[PDB]
Design a protein around this ligand. Structure first.
Ligand SMILES: [Zn+2]
Length: 46
């Protein structure tokens, strides 16, 4: 599609998991909590 920030593009920080927009990136981080989605590696590796 059309990808580019040259005109139309408001609310750069918004949630998609449940659908909740925000204002400050700091806010999105506070909401990311309930939206668990991490992938920490283990102490061993192959
Ligand atoms: Zn959400």
């Amino acid at each position: 599609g059309s990808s580019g920030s040259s005109g139309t593009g408001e609310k750069p920080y918004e949630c998609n998991q449940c659908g909740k927009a925000f204002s400050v990136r700091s806010s999105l981080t506070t909401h990311q909590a309930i939206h668990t989605g991490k992938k920490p590696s283990g102490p061993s590796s192959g």
